[PDB]
């Protein structure tokens, strides 16, 4: 019959027999490479547009099957690419954006407060997808855990030589810059980006301090001076990238204090008092260890005396502190990925033919 002049509603329709193909071409076989320079998180937007048509047509089987198959496809891709930072970051970003869409367009007033009138026209009408959002939320946490695992594994061999000693600092920074560039390009939430680097800089803090707590060959005034300089370059890199609100600098306070301790005078009651008031982020045990390990680099200086160490120990009596000497390098900070509604209108999503998704027609 005769058709009206109909404009795009921002929905994408497909036949149920083509779902396996959709999941194949949009998830299973998708390479992040191909998607530059499209809109970032294009798969999340296409996926929501499909879910929205399923809801529009009151098709709860299509809704259930699509979501379930998407979640399974993503887990399959990530198990296959379990050492791939880019691929892992790519699906974190899209899993998050898909979850944001399902919240922002849930139809629940508590999520629709930054929504424009037209955006509200794009809300789901039939289905409450609360259980699927919970699954997507659990999934984003698991993908983030893989991302940290990958990034820490890459950084691990670089740390000791970059901070104390083979790798240079510039190599560490180049790696950090690589990680950051990928996450930005893929549209990962800046709040998640902040939490990633907080985590990685804690690992630098822990691994480097553990080396100072066990090895006399690095506990010298010279190392402390060089270490403090290296940490300052990291801080400058962080500020230059607008990552200084991440909490990353704070995670390095123990190491910073260790580097300064190595440079402080270590002879008098006054010297002892200075060390105690400065080293508020080092336990009594850690401070005493570094003082014991401390080795002058020429015969013109002596080692810290037993008397001095006992003076330190008496000044720190009021402290309980933990117990173990070393820091857990694998400590993971709890995270929160907040709801991040976008000002984007689904009404304007164009789909490249390299995705091979022409069978999806526009409603």
Swiss-Prot record:
Annotated localization: Cytoplasm
Domain named Dilute: residues: 68-318
Functional summary from the UniProt entry: May be involved in vesicular trafficking via its association with the CART complex. The CART complex is necessary for efficient transferrin receptor recycling but not for EGFR degradation. Required in a complex with RAB11A and RAB11FIP2 for the transport of NPC1L1 to the plasma membrane. Together with RAB11A participates in CFTR trafficking to the plasma membrane and TF (transferrin) recycling in nonpolarized cells. Together with RAB11A and RAB8A participates in epithelial cell polarization. Together with RAB25 regulates transcytosis.
Involvement in disorder: Diarrhea 2, with microvillus atrophy, with or without cholestasis: A disease characterized by onset of intractable life-threatening watery diarrhea during infancy. Two forms are recognized: early-onset microvillus inclusion disease with diarrhea beginning in the neonatal period, and late-onset, with first symptoms appearing after 3 or 4 months of life. Cholestasis, progressive familial intrahepatic, 10: A form of progressive cholestasis, a disorder characterized by early onset of cholestasis that progresses to hepatic fibrosis, cirrhosis, and end-stage liver disease. PFIC10 is an autosomal recessive form with highly variable phenotype and severity, manifesting in the first months or years of life.
Assembly and oligomerization: Component of the CART complex, at least composed of ACTN4, HGS/HRS, MYO5B and TRIM3. Interacts with RAB11FIP2, RAB11A, and RAB8A. Found in a complex with CFTR and RAB11A. Interacts with NPC1L1;. Interacts with LIMA1.
Family to which the UniProt record says this protein belongs: Belongs to the TRAFAC class myosin-kinesin ATPase superfamily. Myosin family.
Protein known as: Unconventional myosin-Vb
Covered residues, full protein: 1459 to 1848 of 1848
